[PDB]
Coordinates of C-alpha atoms and ligand atoms in Angstrom, one line a residue:
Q4 CA -0.2 -0.1 0.3
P5 CA 2.0 3.1 -1.3
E6 CA 2.2 6.1 0.8
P7 CA 0.6 9.7 -0.8
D8 CA 2.0 12.3 -1.7
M9 CA -1.1 14.3 -1.9
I10 CA -4.5 14.5 0.5
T11 CA -7.2 16.6 0.5
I12 CA -8.6 18.4 3.0
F13 CA -12.1 20.2 3.7
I14 CA -11.9 22.9 6.0
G15 CA -15.6 24.1 7.4
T16 CA -16.3 27.4 9.2
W17 CA -20.0 27.8 10.5
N18 CA -21.4 30.3 13.2
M19 CA -24.3 28.1 14.7
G20 CA -25.9 31.5 16.1
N21 CA -26.7 29.2 19.2
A22 CA -29.0 27.3 17.2
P23 CA -29.2 23.4 17.1
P24 CA -28.6 22.0 13.2
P25 CA -30.9 21.0 10.8
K26 CA -31.3 17.6 10.1
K27 CA -29.1 17.3 7.1
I28 CA -25.8 19.7 6.7
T29 CA -24.4 17.2 3.9
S30 CA -24.2 20.3 1.2
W31 CA -21.8 21.7 3.4
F32 CA -19.1 19.0 3.4
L33 CA -20.1 18.4 -0.2
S34 CA -18.7 21.5 -1.1
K35 CA -22.7 22.5 -2.5
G36 CA -23.9 26.4 -2.3
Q37 CA -22.6 29.6 -4.1
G38 CA -19.2 30.4 -4.9
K39 CA -16.6 27.8 -6.3
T40 CA -18.3 24.5 -5.8
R41 CA -17.2 20.7 -6.2
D42 CA -18.4 18.5 -9.0
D43 CA -21.4 16.1 -9.1
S44 CA -19.0 13.3 -10.1
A45 CA -16.7 13.6 -7.1
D46 CA -19.8 13.1 -4.0
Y47 CA -19.2 9.9 -2.9
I48 CA -14.9 10.2 -3.3
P49 CA -14.0 11.3 0.8
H50 CA -11.8 14.3 2.1
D51 CA -8.4 12.4 3.7
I52 CA -9.5 15.0 6.5
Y53 CA -12.6 17.3 7.4
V54 CA -11.8 19.6 10.2
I55 CA -14.6 21.8 11.5
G56 CA -14.4 24.6 12.8
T57 CA -18.0 26.3 15.1
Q58 CA -18.6 29.1 16.5
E59 CA -21.5 30.2 18.9
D60 CA -21.3 26.5 18.9
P61 CA -24.4 25.5 21.5
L62 CA -23.6 21.1 21.3
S63 CA -22.0 18.9 23.3
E64 CA -19.0 17.7 22.0
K65 CA -20.6 14.6 21.5
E66 CA -23.9 15.7 20.3
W67 CA -22.0 17.0 17.3
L68 CA -19.1 14.2 16.8
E69 CA -22.7 12.2 16.7
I70 CA -24.3 15.0 14.1
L71 CA -20.9 14.9 11.9
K72 CA -19.7 11.3 11.9
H73 CA -22.9 9.9 10.7
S74 CA -23.1 13.2 8.2
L75 CA -20.0 11.4 6.2
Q76 CA -21.1 8.1 6.8
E77 CA -23.9 8.8 4.9
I78 CA -22.0 10.7 1.7
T79 CA -19.0 8.5 1.8
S80 CA -20.5 5.5 3.3
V81 CA -17.2 5.6 5.8
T82 CA -16.9 5.9 9.3
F83 CA -14.5 8.8 10.3
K84 CA -11.7 8.5 12.8
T85 CA -11.5 11.0 15.3
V86 CA -8.2 12.6 15.4
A87 CA -8.8 15.9 18.0
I88 CA -11.7 18.0 19.3
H89 CA -11.3 20.8 21.4
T90 CA -13.7 23.8 22.6
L91 CA -13.3 27.1 24.2
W92 CA -16.3 28.6 25.5
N93 CA -18.6 28.2 22.4
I94 CA -15.4 27.9 19.6
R95 CA -14.8 24.5 18.2
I96 CA -12.6 22.8 16.6
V97 CA -13.5 19.0 15.4
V98 CA -10.7 16.8 12.8
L99 CA -11.4 13.8 11.2
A100 CA -9.8 11.3 9.5
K101 CA -10.1 8.3 7.1
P102 CA -9.6 5.1 9.1
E103 CA -6.6 4.3 6.4
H104 CA -4.6 7.4 7.7
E105 CA -4.6 6.4 11.9
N106 CA -1.4 5.1 11.5
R107 CA 0.0 8.1 9.4
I108 CA -1.6 11.1 11.8
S109 CA 0.7 11.8 15.1
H110 CA 2.0 14.3 17.8
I111 CA -1.8 15.6 18.0
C112 CA -1.5 18.7 19.9
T113 CA -4.4 21.2 20.6
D114 CA -4.4 24.6 22.6
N115 CA -6.9 28.1 22.6
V116 CA -6.2 31.3 23.5
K117 CA -8.5 33.8 24.7
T118 CA -8.4 37.0 23.9
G119 CA -9.4 40.9 25.2
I120 CA -9.3 41.8 28.9
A121 CA -12.4 41.9 31.2
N122 CA -14.7 43.3 29.6
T123 CA -13.6 42.1 26.1
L124 CA -12.4 38.7 27.8
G125 CA -15.0 36.0 28.1
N126 CA -16.2 34.8 24.8
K127 CA -13.8 35.7 21.6
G128 CA -10.5 33.7 21.1
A129 CA -9.5 30.9 19.0
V130 CA -8.9 27.0 19.1
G131 CA -6.2 24.8 17.1
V132 CA -5.1 21.5 16.4
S133 CA -2.0 20.2 15.1
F134 CA -0.5 16.8 14.1
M135 CA 2.3 15.2 11.3
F136 CA 0.9 13.5 8.7
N137 CA 3.3 10.9 7.7
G138 CA 5.8 13.9 7.0
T139 CA 4.3 16.7 7.0
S140 CA 3.1 19.1 9.6
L141 CA -0.7 20.3 9.7
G142 CA -2.2 23.0 11.5
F143 CA -5.8 24.4 12.0
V144 CA -7.0 27.3 13.6
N145 CA -10.7 27.8 14.1
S146 CA -10.8 31.8 15.6
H147 CA -13.9 33.5 16.3
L148 CA -12.6 37.6 16.2
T149 CA -14.2 40.6 17.5
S150 CA -17.5 41.7 15.9
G151 CA -18.5 45.3 14.9
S152 CA -18.3 47.0 12.1
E153 CA -15.9 49.5 13.8
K154 CA -13.6 47.5 15.4
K155 CA -11.4 45.8 12.4
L156 CA -8.3 47.2 14.4
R157 CA -9.4 44.9 17.7
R158 CA -9.9 41.8 14.9
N159 CA -6.2 42.7 14.0
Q160 CA -4.9 42.6 17.5
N161 CA -6.9 39.6 18.2
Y162 CA -4.9 37.8 15.3
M163 CA -1.5 38.8 16.7
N164 CA -2.7 37.6 20.1
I165 CA -3.7 34.6 18.6
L166 CA -0.4 33.6 16.0
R167 CA 1.8 34.8 19.6
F168 CA 0.2 32.5 22.6
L169 CA -1.5 29.5 20.5
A170 CA 0.8 26.9 21.5
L171 CA 0.4 24.1 18.5
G172 CA 3.8 21.7 16.3
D173 CA 6.7 20.9 17.6
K174 CA 7.7 22.8 21.2
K175 CA 11.4 22.6 20.3
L176 CA 10.6 25.4 17.4
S177 CA 11.1 28.2 19.9
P178 CA 11.9 31.1 17.7
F179 CA 9.1 30.4 16.0
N180 CA 5.0 31.0 15.9
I181 CA 2.0 29.1 14.5
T182 CA 3.2 31.1 10.7
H183 CA 6.0 29.4 10.4
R184 CA 5.6 26.0 12.3
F185 CA 3.8 23.7 9.6
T186 CA 4.6 22.3 6.4
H187 CA 0.8 23.7 5.7
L188 CA -1.5 26.2 8.3
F189 CA -5.3 27.0 7.6
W190 CA -6.6 29.8 9.6
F191 CA -10.6 30.0 9.5
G192 CA -13.7 31.2 11.7
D193 CA -15.4 33.8 12.3
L194 CA -13.3 36.5 11.5
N195 CA -15.9 38.9 11.5
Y196 CA -14.7 41.8 9.1
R197 CA -17.5 43.6 7.7
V198 CA -18.2 45.5 4.4
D199 CA -17.2 48.7 5.3
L200 CA -19.8 50.9 3.2
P201 CA -22.7 53.8 4.9
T202 CA -25.2 52.7 6.8
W203 CA -27.7 54.7 4.4
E204 CA -26.5 51.7 1.7
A205 CA -28.1 48.6 2.9
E206 CA -30.5 48.1 0.3
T207 CA -28.4 49.8 -2.3
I208 CA -26.0 46.6 -0.8
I209 CA -28.6 43.9 -0.9
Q210 CA -29.6 45.2 -4.5
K211 CA -26.1 44.2 -5.7
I212 CA -26.0 40.8 -3.9
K213 CA -29.4 39.8 -5.7
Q214 CA -27.4 40.8 -8.8
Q215 CA -24.4 38.7 -7.7
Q216 CA -22.4 42.1 -8.7
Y217 CA -19.7 41.6 -5.6
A218 CA -17.2 43.2 -7.0
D219 CA -18.0 47.1 -5.1
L220 CA -18.8 45.2 -1.8
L221 CA -15.1 43.0 -2.2
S222 CA -13.5 46.3 -2.8
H223 CA -15.1 47.6 1.1
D224 CA -14.2 44.5 2.2
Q225 CA -12.3 45.7 5.7
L226 CA -10.6 41.8 5.4
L227 CA -9.3 42.5 1.9
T228 CA -8.3 45.5 2.7
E229 CA -6.3 45.1 6.0
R230 CA -4.2 42.3 4.1
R231 CA -3.2 44.6 0.7
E232 CA -2.3 47.3 4.0
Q233 CA -0.2 44.5 5.3
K234 CA -2.2 45.4 8.9
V235 CA -3.3 41.5 9.8
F236 CA -2.6 37.7 7.9
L237 CA 0.6 38.9 6.4
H238 CA 1.9 35.8 3.8
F239 CA -1.6 34.2 3.9
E240 CA -3.7 33.5 0.8
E241 CA -7.3 33.2 0.7
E242 CA -9.1 32.2 -3.0
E243 CA -11.5 34.6 -4.7
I244 CA -14.5 35.0 -3.1
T245 CA -17.3 34.2 -5.4
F246 CA -20.6 33.7 -3.0
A247 CA -22.6 36.1 -1.2
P248 CA -22.0 37.6 2.1
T249 CA -22.6 35.0 4.5
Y250 CA -23.9 37.4 7.8
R251 CA -26.4 38.4 8.5
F252 CA -29.5 36.5 7.7
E253 CA -32.8 36.2 8.9
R254 CA -33.2 32.7 9.8
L255 CA -35.3 29.7 8.3
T256 CA -34.3 31.4 5.1
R257 CA -32.0 32.9 3.0
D258 CA -34.1 35.3 1.1
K259 CA -33.6 38.2 4.0
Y260 CA -30.6 40.0 4.9
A261 CA -31.6 41.2 8.6
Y262 CA -29.0 44.4 8.5
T263 CA -31.2 47.0 10.9
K264 CA -30.1 47.8 14.3
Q265 CA -32.1 46.8 17.2
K266 CA -30.9 45.9 20.9
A267 CA -30.8 42.3 20.6
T268 CA -27.4 43.7 18.2
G269 CA -26.8 46.4 20.6
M270 CA -28.0 49.1 18.7
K271 CA -25.7 48.0 15.6
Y272 CA -25.9 47.6 11.9
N273 CA -24.7 44.3 10.8
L274 CA -24.6 45.7 6.9
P275 CA -24.1 42.1 4.8
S276 CA -20.6 40.8 5.2
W277 CA -18.5 38.2 4.4
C278 CA -17.5 37.1 8.0
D279 CA -17.1 33.7 7.7
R280 CA -13.9 32.9 6.2
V281 CA -10.7 30.5 5.3
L282 CA -7.1 31.4 4.7
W283 CA -4.0 29.4 4.1
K284 CA 0.0 29.4 4.8
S285 CA 1.9 26.9 3.2
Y286 CA 5.9 26.9 3.1
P287 CA 7.8 27.6 0.2
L288 CA 7.2 25.6 -3.3
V289 CA 4.7 22.9 -1.4
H290 CA 1.6 21.9 -3.6
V291 CA -1.3 23.6 -2.0
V292 CA -5.0 24.3 -4.4
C293 CA -8.1 25.1 -3.6
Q294 CA -10.4 23.3 -4.8
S295 CA -13.6 24.9 -3.3
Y296 CA -14.4 27.9 -1.5
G297 CA -18.2 28.7 -0.8
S298 CA -21.5 29.0 1.2
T299 CA -24.5 26.9 1.5
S300 CA -28.2 27.6 0.7
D301 CA -30.2 25.0 2.3
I302 CA -28.9 25.3 6.5
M303 CA -31.1 28.1 7.7
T304 CA -30.6 27.4 11.0
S305 CA -28.1 30.3 12.0
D306 CA -27.7 34.1 10.6
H307 CA -24.6 33.0 9.6
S308 CA -24.4 30.6 6.5
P309 CA -21.6 27.7 7.0
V310 CA -18.4 28.8 4.5
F311 CA -16.3 24.7 3.0
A312 CA -13.0 25.0 1.8
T313 CA -11.3 22.1 -0.1
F314 CA -7.4 22.1 -0.8
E315 CA -5.3 19.5 -2.4
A316 CA -2.2 19.7 -0.4
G317 CA 1.3 18.3 -1.0
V318 CA 2.4 15.4 1.6
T319 CA 5.5 13.7 2.0
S320 CA 6.5 10.2 3.2
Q321 CA 8.3 9.7 6.9
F322 CA 11.9 8.4 5.2
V323 CA 14.5 5.7 6.6
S324 CA 17.8 5.5 5.0
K325 CA 20.8 3.1 6.1
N326 CA 22.1 6.4 7.9
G327 CA 19.5 8.8 9.1
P328 CA 17.0 9.1 11.2
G329 CA 19.7 8.7 14.2
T330 CA 22.8 10.0 12.5
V331 CA 24.1 12.2 9.4
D332 CA 24.3 11.4 6.2
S333 CA 28.1 12.9 4.7
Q334 CA 27.2 12.9 0.9
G335 CA 24.8 15.8 1.8
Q336 CA 25.5 19.3 3.3
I337 CA 24.0 22.7 3.1
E338 CA 25.8 25.6 2.9
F339 CA 24.5 29.1 3.3
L340 CA 27.0 31.9 1.1
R341 CA 27.4 35.1 1.3
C342 CA 24.1 35.7 3.2
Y343 CA 23.0 39.1 5.1
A344 CA 19.8 40.3 7.0
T345 CA 18.3 43.4 6.4
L346 CA 16.7 44.3 9.8
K347 CA 14.0 47.1 10.2
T348 CA 14.9 47.3 14.4
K349 CA 17.2 50.5 15.8
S350 CA 19.1 48.4 18.3
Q351 CA 22.3 47.9 18.2
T352 CA 23.3 44.3 19.3
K353 CA 25.1 41.7 17.8
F354 CA 23.6 39.5 15.8
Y355 CA 23.3 35.5 15.3
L356 CA 21.2 33.0 13.4
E357 CA 19.5 29.8 14.1
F358 CA 19.0 26.9 11.6
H359 CA 16.1 24.8 12.2
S360 CA 14.9 22.0 10.0
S361 CA 13.6 17.8 10.7
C362 CA 16.0 17.0 8.4
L363 CA 19.2 18.3 11.1
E364 CA 19.1 16.3 14.3
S365 CA 19.3 19.3 16.3
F366 CA 19.1 23.5 15.1
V367 CA 22.6 25.0 14.3
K368 CA 23.9 28.3 15.8
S369 CA 25.4 30.5 13.8
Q370 CA 28.7 33.2 15.0
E371 CA 27.6 36.5 15.1
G372 CA 27.2 38.5 12.0
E373 CA 28.7 41.9 11.0
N374 CA 26.9 44.8 11.3
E375 CA 26.9 47.3 8.7
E376 CA 24.7 50.8 8.4
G377 CA 21.9 50.5 4.8
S378 CA 22.1 53.9 2.7
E379 CA 18.4 54.3 3.3
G380 CA 18.8 53.8 7.4
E381 CA 18.9 50.1 8.0
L382 CA 20.5 47.7 9.8
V383 CA 22.1 45.3 7.6
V384 CA 24.0 41.9 9.4
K385 CA 26.5 39.8 7.2
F386 CA 27.2 36.8 7.7
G387 CA 30.1 36.3 4.8
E388 CA 31.0 32.4 4.3
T389 CA 31.1 32.2 7.9
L390 CA 28.0 30.4 8.4
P391 CA 28.3 26.7 9.6
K392 CA 27.9 24.1 7.1
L393 CA 24.3 21.7 8.0
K394 CA 24.4 17.9 8.3
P395 CA 21.4 16.7 6.9
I396 CA 20.3 13.2 8.3
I397 CA 19.4 12.6 4.7
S398 CA 21.1 12.6 2.0
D399 CA 19.2 10.8 -0.8
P400 CA 17.8 14.2 -2.6
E401 CA 14.3 12.8 -3.5
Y402 CA 14.1 13.9 0.6
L403 CA 16.4 16.3 0.9
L404 CA 14.8 18.7 -1.8
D405 CA 11.5 18.4 0.1
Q406 CA 13.0 20.2 3.2
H407 CA 12.3 23.5 4.5
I408 CA 15.2 25.4 6.3
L409 CA 13.6 27.8 9.0
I410 CA 16.1 30.7 10.3
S411 CA 15.9 33.2 13.2
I412 CA 17.7 35.7 13.7
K413 CA 18.4 36.8 17.2
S414 CA 19.9 39.4 19.6
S415 CA 23.7 38.3 21.1
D416 CA 22.4 40.4 24.2
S417 CA 18.7 39.2 24.9
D418 CA 18.8 36.0 22.9
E419 CA 15.6 37.0 21.6
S420 CA 14.4 36.6 18.0
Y421 CA 13.8 39.9 16.0
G422 CA 13.2 38.1 12.4
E423 CA 11.7 34.3 11.5
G424 CA 11.5 33.4 7.9
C425 CA 12.0 29.9 5.7
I426 CA 13.6 28.9 2.8
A427 CA 12.7 26.1 0.9
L428 CA 15.5 23.4 -0.4
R429 CA 13.5 22.7 -3.9
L430 CA 15.5 24.1 -6.0
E431 CA 16.4 24.3 -9.3
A432 CA 20.1 22.7 -9.3
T433 CA 22.4 20.6 -6.8
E434 CA 26.1 21.1 -6.4
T435 CA 25.3 24.9 -7.7
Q436 CA 25.2 28.3 -6.0
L437 CA 21.4 29.8 -5.9
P438 CA 20.3 32.9 -5.0
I439 CA 17.8 32.2 -1.7
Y440 CA 15.4 35.1 0.1
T441 CA 12.7 35.0 3.0
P442 CA 10.7 37.7 4.6
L443 CA 11.5 38.1 8.2
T444 CA 8.5 38.9 10.3
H445 CA 8.2 38.4 14.5
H446 CA 4.7 38.3 15.7
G447 CA 3.6 38.4 12.3
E448 CA 4.8 41.4 11.3
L449 CA 7.3 42.3 9.1
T450 CA 10.6 42.9 10.6
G451 CA 13.2 42.7 7.7
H452 CA 14.5 40.3 5.1
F453 CA 17.0 37.7 5.0
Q454 CA 19.0 37.3 1.0
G455 CA 22.0 35.0 -0.1
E456 CA 23.2 32.2 -1.3
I457 CA 22.9 28.6 -1.2
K458 CA 24.7 25.4 -2.4
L459 CA 23.2 22.3 -1.9
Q460 CA 25.1 19.1 -1.9
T461 CA 22.7 15.3 -2.3
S462 CA 23.9 12.0 -3.2
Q463 CA 23.1 12.8 -6.4
Ligands
H0D501 C1 -4.1 7.3 21.7 C2 -2.6 7.9 21.8 C3 -2.7 9.1 20.9 C4 -2.5 10.6 22.4 O1 -3.2 10.8 22.7 N1 -3.9 9.8 19.8 C5 -4.2 9.0 18.6 O2 -3.2 8.6 18.5 N2 -5.3 9.7 18.4 C6 -5.7 9.2 16.9 C7 -4.7 9.2 16.1 C8 -4.8 8.8 14.8 C9 -6.5 9.2 14.3 CL1 -6.6 8.9 12.7 C10 -7.6 9.1 15.0 C11 -6.7 9.3 16.3
H0D502 C1 1.7 36.3 -3.6 C2 3.1 37.2 -3.1 C3 2.7 38.1 -3.7 C4 4.2 39.3 -3.9 O1 4.4 40.5 -3.9 N1 1.8 39.2 -3.7 C5 0.5 39.1 -3.2 O2 0.7 38.2 -2.1 N2 -0.2 40.2 -3.0 C6 -1.3 40.7 -2.1 C7 -1.7 40.2 -0.6 C8 -3.0 40.5 -0.6 C9 -4.1 41.2 -0.9 CL1 -5.4 41.5 -0.2 C10 -3.7 41.6 -2.3 C11 -2.4 41.0 -3.3

């Protein structure tokens, strides 16, 4: 039985509005409704992994697991295994996988983050799950961010708290937050960004939705505008939105958007918005293709409609050679040549690098670089040809060219990371000096750049 080099992953996000679901929710898992929808000819083909995020979920874990498993069994005639379930208040994540994957899945982690302080602490935050699928690390975040059209900055703050404090994946990757720990990271939820148009334009907006004319609405979507201004979700992807706003509906129909201010809303308008989103971030040059992104039309118990997204994701096999794991493979080496970091910091400490990768027995600390002043004010940290030669555990190019090196630049004075990035070893050539590049971030914000050349020796 061969190990896969691709899997498909279903992501669902649904703010259930504190109401039980209807008896049939299969359209959700079949990616049927509005938007980029899945071909009918695929209906019986199970996804490999289903990750379900809910918000305002009124059910017990047991109640929801029974609905989800019986839903998938009806679609696929497969009895899915529960990988993980984690709930914070009424925010929940469920991961289900095909039984054939049970022995491929390991290192399962769960965590949650509560956002806000005092007043603003007590119902918003995030849950997440990570695990290994053979040689590939997968992370999943379901967040329910702060509500209200005039709170986009709070949402952006909630995002930074979640990526700083959610403790998933390999704890040995200590300089790295969740935005660097996984081959593939999926972040979804009721992100609660709104269409920023005047209240007076409500009926115009509804008109546009009925005509399926989303362009003039998407141009005011706060998540797209905040992302374009690099205020949030830096280096994440989202598929193009081609489905109607998923909030705020009158319950038991989808014919009516309920936007007017009410005591129940705190006297806030809820103009039609794309609150419910799926984004991802994968390591450079790893296959990831969105094959659906849309909303259901026939599940009407909530004031939100469910959102689905599906992905092809590249995965790698556990690799065993005669040599590694358990030793180095002397026919392998990674040389980082003529490298320099460009940092936005005003500090004047010396800096060193750390190289982290599951292709190394343990992380590697460099010597301190040489600081110079850039022409436009910047700090440039030069490493020259001084960087330690990295000794991978396995030299076989079928393994090594699929790996990645995480880089942290740390202060000698404080040992704190000033920037984190990632370099793919999927090179155009071996035994050849080739340009490399990564942006550097810290707490998910841009802090600089790392560039230089690499020379990779494999056994071929
Ligand atoms: C039982 C010991 C560990 C740690 O709790 N759990 C585990 O491996 N769970 C699991 C793996 C694969 C799949 Cl498909 C479903 C569940
Ligand atoms: C894929 C990386 C390239 C490099 O420039 N561009 C990019 O990501 N552009 C972009 C991001 C967010 C939004 Cl909202 C609109 C455009």
